[PDB]
Design a protein around this nucleic acid. Structure first.
Length: 58
RNA sequence: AUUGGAGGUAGAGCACUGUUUGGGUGAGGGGUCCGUCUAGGAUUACCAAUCUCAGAUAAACUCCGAAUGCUAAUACACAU
């Protein structure tokens, strides 16, 4: 499963344990779809951070 | 993200320290009279000496015991 990564919310107004995670995925402005790394357990990014990104199978 | 530990916090029940509701349990301590060789046997009365059974009760209760988080290694992702 190879998944690209989207956005639904600005990072303003959340935990820095969300800020640095979005930073770790490295998107910058919104919905710059980082077409990368659908390997699991950094699916913990897409699932711990699941309030934020549509799972888009790249 | 997984594994590894650690912490007793919240919660709870009471396992101890505290407080406490009943019910049972009882010397005794104050009410007949026999009665001050003579003490008493007493009547019931408040607690009934504990303990027993349910009922709780808490920051300085904890036989327990989280979820969270913190840390170690590993994994993957990055760039510090």
């Amino acid at each position: 499963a190879q998944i690209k990564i989207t956005l639904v919310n600005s990072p303003i107004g959340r935990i820095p344990a969300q800020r640095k995670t979005v930073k770790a995925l490295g998107l910058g402005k919104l919905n710059s779809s980082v077409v990368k790394e659908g390997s699991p357990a950094i699916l913990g990014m897409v699932n711990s951070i699941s309030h934020l990104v549509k799972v888009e199978e790249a």
